[PDB]
Amino acid sequence: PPTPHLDAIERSLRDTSPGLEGSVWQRTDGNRLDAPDGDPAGWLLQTPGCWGDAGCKDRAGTRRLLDKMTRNIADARHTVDISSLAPFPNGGFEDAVVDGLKASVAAGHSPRVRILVGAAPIYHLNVVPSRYRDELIGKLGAAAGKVTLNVASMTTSKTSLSWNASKLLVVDGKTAITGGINTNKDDYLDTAHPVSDVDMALSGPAARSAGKYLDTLWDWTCRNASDPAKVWLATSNGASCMPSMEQDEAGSAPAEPTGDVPVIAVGGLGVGIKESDPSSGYHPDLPTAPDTKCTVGLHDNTNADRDYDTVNPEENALRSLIASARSHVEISQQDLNATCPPLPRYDIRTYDTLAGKLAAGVKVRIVVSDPANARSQIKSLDEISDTLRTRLVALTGDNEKASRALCGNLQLASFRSSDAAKWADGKPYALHHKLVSVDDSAFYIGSKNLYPAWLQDFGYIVESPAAAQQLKTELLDPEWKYSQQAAATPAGCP
Numbered sequence: 001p002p003t004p005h006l007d008a009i010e011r012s013l014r015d016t017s018p019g020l021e022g023s024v025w026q027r028t029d030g031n032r033l034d035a036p037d038g039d040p041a042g043w044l045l046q047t048p049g050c051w052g053d054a055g056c057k058d059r060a061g062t063r064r065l066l067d068k069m070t071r072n073i074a075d076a077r078h079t080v081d082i083s084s085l086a087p088f089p090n091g092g093f094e095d096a097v098v099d100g101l102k103a104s105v106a107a108g109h110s111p112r113v114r115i116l117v118g119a120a121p122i123y124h125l126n127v128v129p130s131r132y133r134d135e136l137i138g139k140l141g142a143a144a145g146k147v148t149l150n151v152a153s154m155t156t157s158k159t160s161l162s163w164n165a166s167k168l169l170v171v172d173g174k175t176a177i178t179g180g181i182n183t184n185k186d187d188y189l190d191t192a193h194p195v196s197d198v199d200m201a202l203s204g205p206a207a208r209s210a211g212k213y214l215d216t217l218w219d220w221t222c223r224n225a226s227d228p229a230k231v232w233l234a235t236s237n238g239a240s241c242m243p244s245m246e247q248d249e250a251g252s253a254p255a256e257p258t259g260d261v262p263v264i265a266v267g268g269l270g271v272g273i274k275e276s277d278p279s280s281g282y283h284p285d286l287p288t289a290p291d292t293k294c295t296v297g298l299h300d301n302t303n304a305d306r307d308y309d310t311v312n313p314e315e316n317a318l319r320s321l322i323a324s325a326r327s328h329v330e331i332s333q334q335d336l337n338a339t340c341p342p343l344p345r346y347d348i349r350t351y352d353t354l355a356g357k358l359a360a361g362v363k364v365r366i367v368v369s370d371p372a373n374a375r376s377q378i379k380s381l382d383e384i385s386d387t388l389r390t391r392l393v394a395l396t397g398d399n400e401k402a403s404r405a406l407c408g409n410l411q412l413a414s415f416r417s418s419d420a421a422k423w424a425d426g427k428p429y430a431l432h433h434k435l436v437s438v439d440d441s442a443f444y445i446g447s448k449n450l451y452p453a454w455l456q457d458f459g460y461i462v463e464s465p466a467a468a469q470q471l472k473t474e475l476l477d478p479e480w481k482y483s484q485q486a487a488a489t490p491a492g493c494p
């Protein structure tokens with residue numbers, strides 16, 4: 001089966017981060033999208049799952065998600081590997097972790113279990129690793145004895161704002177859940193106004209891909225627990241740190257296929273883990289596009305740092321995915337722009353890639369979280385359409401060439417999930433996707449935001465017309481049906 005989008009992407013990843021192939025990024029064949037029998041699109045795990053309902057009474061999406069996490073951990077034979085933004089899994093996320101582990105222990109297994117959270121230098125951890133570990137041990141009861149725990153919170157750069165934001169649940173290196181959904185009960189489960197988000201479930205070689213990525217982070221985490229300012233670590237039963245748990249489980253055996261889906265796993269190492277890819281010949285000429293709204297105090301890793309690209313292939317992977325679009329691009333994000341300062345306002349290359357698509361007649365849709373949320377980082381969606389216009393002029397010369405590209409090919413709106421502008425409690429809709437879909441053939445579902453950020457993130461890029469059709473039917477088309485009544489007509493357009 002031809003994967004023309006994956007191929008372009010792979011080309012860029014190999015040119016950017018050749019040494020990181022097979023740890024921080026990897027293409028594999030033979031994957032399956034882990035849908036429950038009789039629910040073929042059930043691999044797409046959206047929360048909360050209430051299109052057409054501003055009241056959101058039946059959070060079916062959220063319970064499919066929690067039940068899929070529970071079931072996947074319940075099936076664990078050897079390893080469970082969890083990462084998220086802080087806090088550690090709480091509320092129903094914790095329940096799914098505990099419940100699954102008890103099942104695994106009942107079926108006679110002794111699972112090893114790693115749990116990694118990123119934390120900003122500003123963020124105060126209420127439940128620190130030793131308290132989290134103790135809490136799980138109590139909740140596990142008699143089964144704790146069979147469960148080897150590694151619990152850790154990490155910050156990799158204080159001055160350059162880098163910590164883990166990957167959101168992974170990998171089991172036995174065989175199944176993986178990932179997306180934008182943090183294990184934070186208060187955004188998703190305990191509220192009259194839940195965040196909207198999406199994860200995907202998968203099984204096969206690409207689950208091992210995620211595993212080796214987490215090994216890369218645990219290698220750094222284990223080594224740097226010698227510096228409590230960066231890492232807080234707690235193990236149970238007197239266990240060592242486990243930097244290579246996914247590798248141990250994999251062994252010499254190559255991962256067995258479980259379906260026919262081609263996938264590119266790709267993440268990034270942020271700042272402070274590795275300076276550069278020593279084997280990389282990446283030699284871009286980086287844009288010089290000083291921005292109206294902002295200058296950066298901090299050194300701009302997004303727009304002006306060759307080395308940062310070499311140890312962060314997800315950045316260029318997202319740029320390649322957009323660049324691969326021959327027909328149309330759908331972007332659904334919390335934000336395109338970052339709040340600047342401190343971070344650069346936007347990723348110049350992304351916007352240039354998008355402007356180039358606008359000028360070639362490729363259709364571009366951008367849905368972002370409602371600016372009535374700053375959970376958002378722009379005052380008005382004109383910020384995005386203005387930026388695209390400046391970059392269009394910077395490309396085509398004259399304005400009404402850009403206006404022809406912009407006004408004819410751009411859909412831009414804030415996210416709605418029902419006909420209601422907001423929820424019952426008056427709070428607006430918060431969108432937390434990190435999703436890109438291209439030509440109804442290839443899509444990214446993961447944790448890497450399109451706005452500038454220097455965290456460790458990870459996600460999957462799938463090339464499957466049948467899966468993208470499902471993605472289009474279950475998420476993109478509904479989103480646009482409701483979000484177009486919050487759409488912007490860019491300034492200077494009919």
Ligand SMILES: O=P([O-])([O-])O[C@@H]1[C@H](O)[C@H](O)[C@@H](O)[C@H](O)[C@H]1O
Pocket residue numbers: 085165180182334375376432447449
């Ligand atoms: O996208 P994410 O990594 O899960 O978390 C987001 C970022 O951490 C960002 O700092 C904040 O401004 C957003 O409000 C969060 O949603």
